[PDB]
Every structure is written in C-alpha cells, then in structure tokens.
C-alpha cells in the first residue's frame, strides 16, 4: 500500500528524469565504454585537438557557463515534476533552486566523467582531465575537486532510476537560508528519503550501507559547491567581465 506508493513515486520520478534530461547516465556509459553504434567521441587533449573540435581558459569557462544555463533549465523542469513542488510558495521554489542547482549539476556531471576526462556536447566530445588541469589559475583548479568526487561517487554504481530520487531529495532541502515555510519542504523530503531507502534496498540489495553512504555524499556535495563558489568570487573580484548569463547572475548573487 504505502510501499506501492513509494514505488509509484520512484517510477514517476524516473519518467520525469527521462523527459527532463536528454543525456542520461545509461547513454553516457555506453559512449564512455564504447558500446554504441555511434562514432567514438572526438577527444580534446590540447590546443591542437581543441581547435579542430579570448584566451583558452576563458573560452572553456564560458562554455561551462552556457551549458550550465541549459542545465539549470532542465533541472527546473525536473523540479516542477516533483509532487508538491509547484504548490510551494514561489519564493521558496526560487530559494530551493538557487541554493541547490549546483549540487545537482555536479551530481549529474559525474555520470559523464571517468578518471581520465568528461563528455561534452551531448556526448560528441571528450575533454581529458589532464587538459583541464593544465589551465591557468584559477580555471585549472575548478574541475580537479569534481574528478576526485566523481571517481568515488561513480564506484557506488547508481543508475538513472537511483539518481532521479537522490536529486529530488537534495532539491527539497529544508535548511537553505531564507526559506519562509520550512515544514512543507521537510514533509516532501521525508517522503522522498523513504522512497530512496526502498529504491536502494530493491535495486542494490547487496551494497553495504548504500543509503548512509549516499547521505554522506550530499554533505560532500555542499563542500564541493562552497569551494566552487569561492573560485567564482575570486574570478569576479580579479578577472575581466565574463558577461554572465542573467540567469546565472541571479543564482550567484546570493551565495557569493
């Protein structure tokens, strides 16, 4: 009865994730392991390769920004399908997205990453980790912490069905600053956490302490974002104007 409703919730969340996110983890791992009738991705490992495929660091930084705009839009559409979300105070919907969208971007980016690099252009490109590491300060310091995160996170072996619920739980955090109505958010989160617990027991029966492991990952995600926003601050204080997308400006305004 109640277990049936938590599976229906699980499944609705997966359906919405499929509709909201055109590049899933299933498809990225097929590309990354080369088990696809598609041509292998174009590898970018320097200027030579980058060129075939402002200064180089900034052209890359600006590519990450443009892709982040689209990602925020897909994550918004996804958040809108989480039952109860559209009925929340609209100021609290805004706050949940502002403080949570980066945590989701880097959770999902991990689907596209291995120890050697990351898929770009909807899986048509692969940009190597050593290449990104070679970018000058502060740009060459952005992704290294995320590879450290991803390699460990990816060895938990979550699938799209697992991620859909993990993501939903993070978005409905009752502890973001400035929330007006904390309670209805915690009530949705609590039901989502129960759904996650059952999903992991059913989909990963033999994975030791997966639930507690994942809850620690949510905490690790906040640190990753704290540091990420420190670098953005430094860039804002000390670099030329990047002409930010107005959508990203609004989000960066409050966490700076």
């Amino acid at each position: 009865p109640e277990s049936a409703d938590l599976r229906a919730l699980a499944k609705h969340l997966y359906d919405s994730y499929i509709k909201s996110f055109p590049l899933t983890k299933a498809k990225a791992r097929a590309i990354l392991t080369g088990k696809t009738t598609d041509k292998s991705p174009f590898v970018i490992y320097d200027m030579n390769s980058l060129m075939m495929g402002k200064e180089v660091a900034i052209r890359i930084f600006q590519g990450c920004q443009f892709r982040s705009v689209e990602a925020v839009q897909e994550i918004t559409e996804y958040a809108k399908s989480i039952p109860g979300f559209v009925n929340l105070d609209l100021n609290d919907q805004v706050t949940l997205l502002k403080y949570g969208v980066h945590e989701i971007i880097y959770t999902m980016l991990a689907s596209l990453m291995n120890k050697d690099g990351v898929l770009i252009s909807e899986g048509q490109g692969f940009m190597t980790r050593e290449f990104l590491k070679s970018l000058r300060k502060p740009f060459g310091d952005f992704m290294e912490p995320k590879f450290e995160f991803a390699v460990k996170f990816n060895a938990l072996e979550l699938d799209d069905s697992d991620l859909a619920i993990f993501i939903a739980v993070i978005i409905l955090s009752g502890d973001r600053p400035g929330l007006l109505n904390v309670k209805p958010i915690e009530d949705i989160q609590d039901n989502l956490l129960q759904a996650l617990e059952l999903q992991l027991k059913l989909n990963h029966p033999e994975s030791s302490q997966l639930f507690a492991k994942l809850l620690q990952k949510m905490t690790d995600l906040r640190q990753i974002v704290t540091e990420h926003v420190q670098l953005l601050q430094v860039i804002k204080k000390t670099e030329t104007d990047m002409s930010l997308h107005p959508l990203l400006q609004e989000i960066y305004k409050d966490l700076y």
């Binding site: 809108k80 609209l90 919907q93 805004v94 997205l97 959508l247 609004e250």
Partner: peptide
Amino acid sequence: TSHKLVQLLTTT
C-alpha cells in the same frame, strides 16, 4: 527580483 527563475518556474 529573481525574474528569470520565476519565469522558468511558471512557464507551461
């Protein structure tokens, strides 16, 4: 303001 977040949130 957060005009752009609200615009995304209410488009159908």
